[PDB]
């Protein structure tokens, strides 16, 4: 078995974020033009997907973390990771 990843990027530098699900936990690695460093994201999950969009130069990141049949959305909007309103019936 193997770790599972999800990736997003934005701009032309670019910024890149790679999320890795390992051991029921998702962590984050970051590229902003000058080497890979560890990001603030740390949430439970066996499976991860991600999307992001810009408003002007402000990134908005949504990470979908799944454990069992429960998927939780995590939101980055410039000032801390918050829990999003996403729900599903799995």
Ligand X SMILES: OC[C@@]1(O)OC[C@@H](O)[C@@H](O)[C@@H]1O
Known binder of ligand: residue 32? Answer: no
Burial of 1 (0-12, 13-18, 19+ CB in 10 A): exposed
The binding track of 3-42 with respect to ligand A1IXG, each residue x by CB under 6 A or -, is -x--------------------------------------
Signed CA dihedral, 90, 1, 83, 64: sign only: negative
Task: Choose between 7 and 37: whose C-beta lies nearer to Zn ion.
Answer: 7
Contact by Cβ (8 Å): 65, 86: no
CB of 88 to ligand A1IXG, least distance (A): 21
Please tell me whether residue 39 binds ligand X under the rule CB under 6 A.
yes
When binding is defined by CB under 6 A, the residue of 40, 51, 54, 88 that contacts ligand X is: 40
Known binder of ligand: residue 7? Answer: yes
Please tell me whether residue 1 binds Zn ion under the rule CB under 5 A.
yes
Distance CA 57, CA 74 (A): 20
Q: Which residues are annotated as a binding site?
A: 1, 7, 46, 60
């Amino acid at each position: 078995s193997s770790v599972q990843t999800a990736a997003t990027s934005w701009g032309t530098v670019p910024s890149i974020r790679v999320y890795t699900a390992n051991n029921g936990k998702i962590t984050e690695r970051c590229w902003d033009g000058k080497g890979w460093y560890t990001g603030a994201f740390n949430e439970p999950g066996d499976n991860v997907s991600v999307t992001s969009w810009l408003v002007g130069s402000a990134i908005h990141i949504r990470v979908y973390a799944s454990t069992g049949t429960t998927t939780t959305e995590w939101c980055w909007d410039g000032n801390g990771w918050t829990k999003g309103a996403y729900t599903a019936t799995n």
